[PDB]
Design a binder for these strands. Structure first.
Ligand SMILES: O=P(O)(O)O[C@H]1[C@@H](OP(=O)(O)O)[C@@H](OP(=O)(O)O)[C@@H](OP(=O)(O)O)[C@@H](OP(=O)(O)O)[C@H]1OP(=O)(O)O
Ligand SMILES: Nc1nc2c(ncn2[C@@H]2O[C@H](COP(=O)(O)OP(=O)(O)OP(=O)(O)O)[C@@H](O)[C@H]2O)c(=O)[nH]1
Ligand SMILES: [Mg+2]
Ligand SMILES: [Mg+2]
Ligand SMILES: [Zn+2]
Ligand SMILES: [Zn+2]
Ligand SMILES: [Zn+2]
Lengths: 144, 301, 144, 73, 241, 96, 49, 99, 97, 98
RNA sequence: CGUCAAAGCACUUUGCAAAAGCUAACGUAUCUGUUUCUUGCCUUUUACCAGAAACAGCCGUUUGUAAGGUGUGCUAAUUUGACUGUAUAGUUUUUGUAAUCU
C-alpha cells in the first residue's frame, strides 16, 4: 500500500545529492521578510503592492469624500516631515503606520539566523574550525 | 396484572437470530444474545431501554447465564470459549478456554462454579477464576444441554444418545440415567427447589423428571405434546416458573407453550415470525419471556 | 509481466520452461482472436480454461514434481505467470480440482450459492449434469 | 554504590563524638572515610564519672559513631 | 526526515520554491510577470484555507467494485489508455446515433464534421450542448496523450522526443484541443501552464543549451491539468447525467 | 527510593527521630543523605528516662535511626515511579 | 551517536546506562530521537532547580 | 550577550538582585556551528566572561559573580531538553560509578 | 516482590525489633523494607499516642499485617415498542411447507 | 447600514489560550498549596534575557515534565506561557505571564 | 535487555463510525459550483471578468472498529501494554553484640 516509508542515512544522503538541482538553499526563513504569506494578506487588505509580489482588487472601496472634510488632522500644516512613509512600513507594522487597518494579518517577527555552512569537501572532519568564524579574542574586559 | 406499562411489549434489536434471553435472578434486568455476537442488557420496568452492549465475543452467543450477584455475566460462545462479562462496567474479566468445539450450553452454581458442554463430546467444570477446567467428563457423542443442582453435587447432561445422565462430581459413579427420550435433548432446566428436572427433546415430547435420591421407578412424572421442533435442529429451551407450578417451552411453529405442570395445556399463545428459541418466566411477577429466531423478543403478562 | 532484453534475468530454472509458457501465450492469443459460436458469456470460457491450465502447470512443476526452485516459483507468482489465489485454493482440502475463482464466489450468483460444478455428482441428478456457464467446467468436485 | 558523607564543614573544628556504650570523645576532626571512619587529633576522653583524660590521636571506626556534634554558636 | 507518508505523485510540486522566493534578476518582462502570477495564485490558495470537514470515507470505485457488474485485473497503462479512448469514442458515436444524426461524422480524432450540406432543420437538430462538446474535447486531449505514448511504444520516437511532446501537449492545450470554447474558465489553467513554461524554459535554456525543442520537464503542467480535472469531474458528471 | 525521597522532602522542617538508644531528637533537619545520615539544629534531646537536654549542631549517622516523625503536610508529596537505572525518583518524560 | 545512524553502538551504550528503547524508536526522525535520548539520559533538569 | 542582556544585567545588579545564568542553545555549538570541543569551551568561557564584565561595570563586589564552579551557571539546550550544571554531571557520574 | 506492592494504601500493624507496634496507612515502601506510614499510632506496653507521618527503618521492622481493605458502560441499539401478537392461520414448522 | 445585523449573532471574544478546566499535573494541587502557604520552599524569580534567546523554552522544559498531558506542537515550539493570540501570531512574547 | 499479563502474528480487501478545544498543516498539496453583493467587458442570453460573504461538491489523508483473504504458526511465532527490575555474609538496612537478669 505505500503509506509510510523509512530510509537509511546513506540512502537519504544519496537522494539529497541526486536531486540537488530542485531544492532551495536558504534554511533561514528570514529571507522571506516582507515576501511571506501574511505580508501578502496584509498587502491585499491594504491594497498596496510589494513591487515583486501579486496585485489584487481593493477589497475596500469605501473611500469617497462622504465626510467631505480633511478633518484638520492629517494636514501638512501640523506635521513634521522627516522621511516618506513607504508601504513597507505599512506592511511591517500594519496597526501603527496606517489607520483603517482591517483584515490585515501579522507575520512572524524574526527567527534565529542559521549559522550552518555545508562542508565543501568530505576530507575535512565533521567538527572543524571554519576560517569565516571570527576568532575568540576579547582582551577588552574588566572582570572581578 | 403486573407492573409493566403495557401488557405486551415487543422488543426490537439485534441484526441476526437471537438464541438466548434470561431474566436477572433479582427480576429487574435481563440480557439477550444471538448470532450477532452481541449481548444486550434491558430494563424490565421503566423505559425498557438499552444501557449496555457486551461487545468483544468472537462467535455466536449460544447461551449466557446471570450471576447471583447480578453483576457479572457468563457467556457461551460458538468460538470454543467462555467469557465472563462484568455487567456494570462491560469489560472482559476472563476468557475460559479448553473445549474443542462449539460449546452448546452453560450453567452457574449457588456457591462461583461454571459447567458447559460442547461438540467435542465433553463437559467441563470451571471455577470463576481458575481459567482452567477443574474436572472433565468425556462422552461418546456430542452433548447439548446441562443443568446443575443448586445443592452442588449433581449435573445433568443431555446429548445425542437421548438418555439424561446424572453425574456426581465427587463420586464419579454414573450408574443412574433418566431414560425415556428417543432423540436429541435440546434443553434441561431444574426447579427452584431442585427437586424436578424439565427436559425438551427433538422427538417433540417435553417430559418432566424428578431429582430425588429415591424414586418409585418410572421417574417420569408426565409428558407434554404440542411443542414441536422443526428441521433446523435448533436448541429450544424449557423454563420453570417462580412458584414452579407452570412449565414452559418454545417450538418451531412460532407458538409459546405454557402448561400447568399437571398435564393440561394452558397458554398456546402465538406471536413470533420464526422458531422460538428460548423461553423464561420472571422470578417475581407473572411475566413470560419469549426468544425467537426472527430478531425479536416478547415480554409477557 | 512483459520482459525486455535489458531486464533482470529470471532465475536459473526459467529457460527450461520458457517455450511451453510461450506456447501458452500463443494459444491465449488464438482464443482472443477466435470469435463466434456462443452466447455473450459462452465465448469467454476458453480463457478461463487456458488460465487454469497454465497455473496448474506451474503448480505441478513446483508441488508435485519439484522441478523448479522456490525462488523461481515465487518469481513466477510475482510476474503473474500463475494465479496466486487459485493456487492457494488448490492447496487446501476440498478444492484440489477447482476450475476458477468465479465458481466459488457466492456474491456473483443470483441466490448466493456457489456454481453447479462444485456439487459432487453423486448428489446431483442425471439431467442437471451440464457444463458450467462461467467457464464450461464439467465438475470441480474433488470426489469426481 | 556507596556515597561520600558530607563533612567538609566539620573539618578542623572542635567536635564531640558519641560512641556506642555511652562513650564520649572530644577532638578536632582531621579526616573521614566512606564508612564514616573518622580521625581525631589532640582529643580528650570522658568517662561516666566525668574526669577528663587526654586520649591523643584517635581513629574511630565509623560503625560505632552514634553522633558527631559541634558546640560553636 | 528519514520517515514520511508517501504523498501522491501530483501532490509534489517540485518547483514551488522557485517562485515563492524572489525573481532572479535580469529576467525578461514576461518571466517576471509569470513569477508574480504564480505567486498570486498561491497566495489566493492559502488565503481561502478551509480546515477540512469531517466525513466518512466514501469512494466511487469501491462501491462499483462491490457490484457483480465490475471486475478487476492488471494491464499495461498504454492498453488501458487505448481502451479508454475507444470506449469514449463508442459512447459518443452511440449518442450521435439514437438521435438520427447519422450524417454527422465523429472521426477518430473526435472532430464532429457533417458528411453533407445540412438544411436549417438538420442544422438546428444537430446542435449539441456544452456538455457533449466539453466531453468530446477532453476525450481529444486524452487521445493526444495516449497517441504520443503509442508512438513511443512503436519505436517511432525515443524517450526524449516523447517527454518533449508531452510537455508540448500540456502547455499547448489551447491550440491543440479548443476545449476553452465550451468552458472559458479553463483560461486560468492555460495561463498557469504558460507561466510554468516561462519559468522552466528560462531555468532550462541557460549556458550551452539554447533555444529550441527539447525541454521535457512536464510534471508541473501535468499536475495543473490534473487539478483542473478534479474540479471539473463532478460538473461533467452532473451535466452528462 | 521513595522513603529516602520523603526524608529529603523533610529538609528544612522540624522532624523528631529516635535512635537505637531510645532518645528522641526535636530539631530542624538541614541535610539528609541516601544513607540517612542527618544534620540537625536547635535539638532538644529527650533521653530514655525523660531527662531533657539541648544540643545545637549534630550529625547523626544513619545506621542508628529507628524512625522519624515527618511533618503532617508531607502526606501529599508525590510518589514518582522509578525506572531501573534511575537512582532518584523524579518526574519522567522519556520511555520509562 | 544519536545523529550518525549507529543503531547497535547506541543501543549497547544505552544498555550500559540501563536506558532501554523500543526497537521502533531507533527508527525515528533525528530530532525526536535526540529529544528521547536526552530525556532518558538527563532526567528532570535538576541542575537548574 | 546582546544589548537587552546588558540592560537586564545592569538593572538587576543596580537593584541588588542575585543572578543565575543559563547558557541556552548549547546544541547549536555541536550540530549547527560544528565547533570542536575545545573551541566550544572557549566560546562558553568567553560568554561567561562578557556577562561578568557587564556585572562588574556596576559593582565590583564579589557577591555578584557568575561562574560554573560556584554552581551559578547552567548549560542548557531547552529544545533538546536538558539543563545541567557542573554538579549535575558530577552527580550523574557518581551515581553510576560509586562513592 | 509484586505482593509487596499490594499492601499500599492499606492499614498495617508492624511489630518492631524494639517490641512496639505501629498502626497506620502504608504510603510507600523500599527495597530495604523502609515503610512510610500515615496517621500512625504507637502501641507501647497498650497506650495510644498519635504520631502522624512516620518513616520506619528497615532494621526496626520485624513483621507486618493488614487490618483493612483499601479505601475508595455506554449505550445500546435496541428500542422497545408495545405491540400485540398476530395469530397466523397456519400450523406447520418453518422448514416444512 | 446594511452591515448591522437585526439579530446580533452570539460572539465570544476569546483573547488568550485559557483551558476550561484545570489540567492534571504530576503533583497534587493540595501539595502545591501547602508548599506555598506553610513552607520556605518557595522561590520567586523572573526569567529574562534578549530576544529569542530561549527563556520561554526554559519554562516549557519544566512544564513538559510537570504536565504529562501537554504534547509538543506540530510545526513550532510549544511556547507555553504566551497565551495571547497576538503573541502566537508574532511568535514572540509581549506580556509577562506568571 | 529482564519479569509478568493477553493477543496468534505479518501483509491485505471491504463495510460502519469519527476526525481543531488549550489558535491550529486531517492535505507542507490544491480544483469546481450555487446564492447574495460590488466590479470589468459589454446590443440580448449562455459563456464570461475579479474581489467579498454565506454555503456546498469533488480529488485525497488519518484513526477506531467489524467481517474476511494470502503466507506462515499453534509440538510456537510475533505484537501490544504494564512493571517499586539486578548483584552482594566482611562497618549505612536482609546471613545478627548475642544470650544472661530486671
Ligand atoms: O509562446 P511563448 O511562451 O512566447 O514562447 C514562444 C514559443 O512558443 P509557441 O510556439 O507557442 O509560440 C516557443 O516555445 P515552445 O513553443 O517551444 O514551447 C519558444 O521557446 P524556445 O525558444 O525556448 O523553444 C519561444 O520562447 P523563448 O523565446 O522565450 O524561448 C517563443 O517565445 P516568443 O513568443 O517570445 O518568441
Ligand atoms: N536549536 C535550538 N533552538 C532553540 C533552543 N531553545 C530554544 N530554541 C528556539 O529558539 C526560538 C525562540 O524560543 P523562545 O522560547 O520563543 O525564546 P523566547 O526567549 O521566549 O523569545 P522571546 O519571548 O521573544 O524573548 C524558538 O525557535 C525555539 O525553538 C535550543 O536549545 N536549541
Ligand atoms: Mg518568551
Ligand atoms: Mg430576445
Ligand atoms: Zn469456474
Ligand atoms: Zn461453475
Ligand atoms: Zn467448475
Amino acid at each position: 500500500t505505500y503509506r509510510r516509508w523509512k530510509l537509511n542515512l546513506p540512502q537519504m544522503a544519496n537522494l539529497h545529492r541526486l536531486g540537488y538541482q530542485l531544492l532551495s538553499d536558504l534554511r533561514d526563513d528570514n529571507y522571506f521578510y516582507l515576501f511571506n504569506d501574511n505580508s501578502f494578506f496584509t498587502a491585499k487588505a491594504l491594497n498596496v503592492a510589494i513591487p515583486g509580489g501579486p496585485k489584487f482588487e481593493p477589497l475596500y472601496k469605501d473611500e469617497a469624500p462622504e465626510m467631505e472634510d480633511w478633518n484638520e488632522f492629517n494636514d501638512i500644516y501640523k506635521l513634521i516631515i522627516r522621511h516618506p512613509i513607504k508601504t513597507e512600513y505599512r506592511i511591517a507594522f500594519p496597526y501603527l503606520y496606517n489607520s483603517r487597518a482591517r483584515s490585515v494579518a501579522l507575520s512572524e517577527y524574526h527567527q534565529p539566523s542559521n549559522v550552518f555552512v555545508p562542508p565543501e569537501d568530505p576530507d575535512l572532519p565533521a567538527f572543524f574550525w571554519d576560517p569565516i568564524i571570527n576568532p575568540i579574542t576579547s582582551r577588552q574586559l574588566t572582570l572581578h | 396484572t403486573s407492573d409493566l406499562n403495557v401488557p405486551n411489549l415487543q422488543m426490537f434489536g439485534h441484526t441476526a437470530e437471537v438464541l438466548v434471553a434470561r431474566f436477572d435472578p433479582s427480576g429487574s434486568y435481563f440480557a439477550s444474545g444471538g448470532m450477532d455476537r452481541q449481548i444486550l442488557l434491558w430494563n424490565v420496568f421503566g423505559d425498557v431501554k438499552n444501557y449496555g452492549v457486551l461487545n468483544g465475543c468472537k462467535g455466536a452467543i449460544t447461551d449466557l447465564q446471570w450471576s447471583r450477584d447480578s453483576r457479572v455475566v457468563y457467556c457461551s460462545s460458538s468460538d470454543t470459549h467462555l467469557m465472563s462479562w462484568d455487567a456494570v462496567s462491560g469489560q472482559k474479566i476472563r476468557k475460559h478456554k479448553g473445549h474443542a468445539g462449539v460449546v452448546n450450553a452453560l450453567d452457574v452454581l449457588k456457591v462461583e462454579l461454571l459447567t458447559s458442554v460442547s461438540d467435542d463430546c465433553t463437559m467441563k467444570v470451571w471455577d470463576s477464576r481458575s481459567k482452567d477446567c477443574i474436572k472433565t467428563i468425556e462422552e461418546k457423542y456430542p452433548l447439548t444441554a446441562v443443568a446443575i443442582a443448586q445443592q452442588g453435587t449433581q449435573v445433568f447432561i443431555g446429548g445425542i444418545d437421548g438418555a439424561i445422565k446424572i453425574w456426581d462430581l465427587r463420586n464419579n459413579h454414573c450408574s443412574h440415567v433418566l431414560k425415556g427420550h428417543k432423540d436429541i435433548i435440546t434443553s434441561l432446566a431444574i426447579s427452584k427447589d431442585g427437586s424436578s428436572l424439565l427436559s425438551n427433546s427433538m422427538d417433540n415430547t417435553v417430559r418432566i423428571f424428578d431429582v430425588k435420591p429415591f424414586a418409585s421407578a418410572q421417574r417420569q412424572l408426565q409428558i407434554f405434546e404440542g411443542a414441536i421442533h422443526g428441521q433446523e435442529h435448533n436448541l429450544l429451551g424449557v423454563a420453570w416458573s417462580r412458584n414452579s407450578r407452570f412449565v414452559g417451552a418454545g417450538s418451531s411453529d412460532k407458538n409459546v407453550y405454557v402448561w400447568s405442570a399437571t398435564g393440561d395445556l394452558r397458554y398456546v399463545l402465538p406471536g413470533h415470525e420464526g422458531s422460538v428459541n428460548h423461553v423464561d418466566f420472571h422470578p417475581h411477577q407473572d411475566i413470560i419471556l419469549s426468544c425467537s429466531s426472527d430478531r425479536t423478543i416478547f415480554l409477557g403478562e | 509481466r512483459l520482459r525486455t532484453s535489458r531486464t533482470k534475468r529470471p532465475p536459473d530454472g526459467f529457460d527450461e520452461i520458457e517455450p511451453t509458457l510461450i506456447e501458452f501465450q500463443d494459444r491465449m492469443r488464438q482464443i482472443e482472436n477466435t470469435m463466434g459460436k456462443g452466447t455473450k458469456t459462452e465465448m469467454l470460457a476458453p480463457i478461463f480454461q487456458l488460465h487454469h491450465q497454465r497455473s496448474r502447470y506451474i503448480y505441478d512443476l513446483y508441488y508435485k514434481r519439484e522441478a523448479i526452485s522456490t525462488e523461481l516459483y515465487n518469481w513466477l507468482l510475482k510476474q503473474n505467470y500463475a494465479d496466486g489465489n487459485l493456487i492457494a485454493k488448490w492447496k487446501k482440502p476440498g478444492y484440489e480440482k477447482l476450475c476458477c475463482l468465479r465458481c466459488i464466489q457466492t456474491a456473483e450468483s443470483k441466490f448466493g450459492s456457489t456454481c453447479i460444478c462444485r456439487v459432487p455428482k453423486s448428489k446431483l441428478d442425471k439431467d442437471q449434469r451440464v457444463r458450467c456457464t462461467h467457464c464450461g467446467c464439467n465438475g470441480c468436485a474433488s470426489c469426481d | 554504590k556507596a556515597g561520600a558523607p558530607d563533612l567538609k564543614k566539620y573539618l578542623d573544628r572542635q567536635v564531640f563524638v558519641q560512641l556506642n556504650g555511652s562513650r564520649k570523645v572530644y577532638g578536632v576532626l582531621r579526616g573521614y572515610d566512606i564508612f564514616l571512619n573518622i580521625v581525631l587529633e589532640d582529643s580528650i576522653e570522658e568517662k561516666v564519672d566525668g574526669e577528663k583524660v587526654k586520649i591523643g590521636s584517635v581513629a574511630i571506626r565509623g560503625n560505632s559513631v552514634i553522633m558527631i556534634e559541634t558546640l560553636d554558636k | 526526515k528519514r520517515s514520511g507518508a508517501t504523498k501522491r505523485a501530483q501532490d509534489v510540486p517540485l518547483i514551488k520554491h522557485w517562485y515563492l522566493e524572489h525573481c532572479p534578476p535580469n529576467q525578461p518582462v514576461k518571466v517576471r510577470v509569470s513569477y508574480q502570477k504564480l505567486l498570486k495564485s498561491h497566495v489566493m490558495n492559502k488565503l481561502h484555507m478551509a480546515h477540512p470537514k469531517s466525513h466518512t470515507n466514501r469512494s466511487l470505485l469501491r462501491q462499483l467494485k462491490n457490484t457483480k457488474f465490475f471486475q478487476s485485473t492488471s494491464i499495461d497503462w498504454v492498453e488501458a489508455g487505448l481502451q479508454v479512448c475507444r470506449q469514449g469514442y463508442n459512447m459518443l458515436q452511440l449518442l450521435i446515433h439514437r438521435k438520427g444524426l447519422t450524417y454527422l461524422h465523429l472521426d477518430y480524432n473526435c472532430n464532429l464534421k457533417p458528411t453533407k450540406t445540412l438544411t436549417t432543420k438538420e442544422r438546428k437538430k444537430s446542435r449539441f450542448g456544452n456538455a457533449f462538446h466539453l466531453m468530446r474535447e477532453i476525450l481529444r486531449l486524452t487521445k493526444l496523450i495516449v497517441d504520443s505514448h503509442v508512438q513511443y511504444r512503436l519505436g517511432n520516437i525515443d524517450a526524449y522526443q516523447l517527454a518533449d511532446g508531452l510537455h508540448y501537449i500540456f502547455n499547448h492545450v489551447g491550440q491543440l484541443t479548443g476545449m476553452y470554447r465550451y468552458k472559458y474558465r479553463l483560461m486560468r489553467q492555460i495561463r498557469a501552464c504558460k507561466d510554468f513554461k516561462h519559468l522552466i524554459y528560462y531555468r532550462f535554456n541557460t549556458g550551452p543549451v539554447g533555444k529550441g525543442p527539447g525541454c521535457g520537464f512536464w510534471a508541473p503542467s501535468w499536475r495543473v491539468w490534473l487539478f483542473f480535472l478534479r474540479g471539473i469531474v463532478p460538473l461533467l458528471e452532473r451535466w452528462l447525467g | 527510593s521513595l522513603c529516602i525521597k520523603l526524608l529529603h522532602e523533610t529538609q528544612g522542617h522540624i522532624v523528631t527521630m529516635e535512635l537505637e538508644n531510645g532518645s528522641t531528637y526535636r530539631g530542624k533537619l538541614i541535610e539528609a543523605e541516601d544513607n540517612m545520615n542527618c544534620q540537625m539544629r536547635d535539638i532538644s534531646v529527650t533521653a530514655r528516662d525523660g531527662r531533657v537536654s539541648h544540643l545545637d549542631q549534630v550529625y547523626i549517622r544513619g545506621s542508628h535511626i529507628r524512625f522519624l516523625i515527618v511533618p503532617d503536610m508531607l502526606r501529599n508529596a508525590p510518589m514518582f515511579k522509578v525506572g531501573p537505572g534511575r537512582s532518584v525518583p523524579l518526574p519522567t518524560r522519556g520511555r520509562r | 551517536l544519536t545523529i550518525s545512524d549507529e543503531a547497535e553502538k547506541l543501543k549497547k551504550h544505552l544498555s550500559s546506562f540501563q536506558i532501554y528503547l523500543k526497537p521502533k524508536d531507533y527508527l525515528l526522525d533525528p530530532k525526536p530521537l535526540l529529544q528521547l535520548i536526552c530525556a532518558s539520559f538527563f532526567g528532570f533538569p535538576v541542575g537548574f532547580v | 550577550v546582546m544589548i537587552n542582556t546588558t540592560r537586564i544585567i545592569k538593572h538587576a545588579i543596580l537593584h541588588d538582585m542575585p543572578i543565575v545564568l543559563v547558557l541556552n542553545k548549547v546544541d547549536r555549538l555541536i550540530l549547527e556551528l560544528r565547533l570542536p570541543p575545545n573551541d566550544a569551551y572557549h566560546k562558553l568561557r568567553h560568554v561567561i566572561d562578557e556577562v561578568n564584565d557587564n556585572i562588574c561595570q556596576i559593582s565590583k563586589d564579589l557577591k555578584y559573580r557568575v561562574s560554573p564552579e560556584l554552581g551559578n551557571v547552567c548549560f542548557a539546550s531547552c529544545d533538546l531538553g536538558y539543563c545541567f550544571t557542573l554538579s549535575s554531571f558530577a552527580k550523574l557520574y557518581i551515581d553510576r560509578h560509586g562513592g | 516482590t509484586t505482593k509487596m506492592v499490594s499492601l499500599l494504601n492499606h492499614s498495617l500493624n508492624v511489630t518492631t525489633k524494639d517490641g512496639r507496634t505501629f498502626v497506620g496507612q502504608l504510603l510507600a515502601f523500599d527495597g530495604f523494607m523502609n515503610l512510610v506510614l500515615s496517621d500512625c499510632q504507637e502501641y507501647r506496653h497498650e497506650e495510644k499516642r498519635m504520631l502522624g507521618l512516620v518513616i520506619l527503618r528497615g532494621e526496626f521492622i520485624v513483621s507486618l499485617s493488614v487490618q483493612g481493605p483499601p479505601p475508595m458502560l455506554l449505550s445500546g441499539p435496541g428500542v422497545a415498542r408495545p405491540a400485540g401478537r398476530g395469530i397466523p392461520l397456519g400450523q406447520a414448522p418453518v422448514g416444512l411447507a | 447600514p446594511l452591515s448591522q445585523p437585526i439579530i446580533e449573532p452570539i460572539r465570544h471574544k476569546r483573547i488568550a489560550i485559557e483551558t476550561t478546566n484545570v489540567p492534571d499535573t504530576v503533583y497534587k494541587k493540595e501539595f502545591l498549596f501547602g508548599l506555598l502557604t506553610g513552607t520556605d520552599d518557595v522561590r520567586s524569580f523572573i526569567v529574562a534575557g534578549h530576544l529569542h534567546h530561549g527563556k520561554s523554552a526554559l519554562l516549557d522544559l519544566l512544564v513538559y515534565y510537570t504536565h504529562p498531558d501537554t504534547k509538543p506542537p506540530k510545526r513550532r515550539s510549544l511556547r507555553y506561557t504566551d497565551t495571547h493570540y497576538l503573541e502566537r501570531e508574532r511568535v514572540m512574547s509581549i506580556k509577562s505571564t506568571p
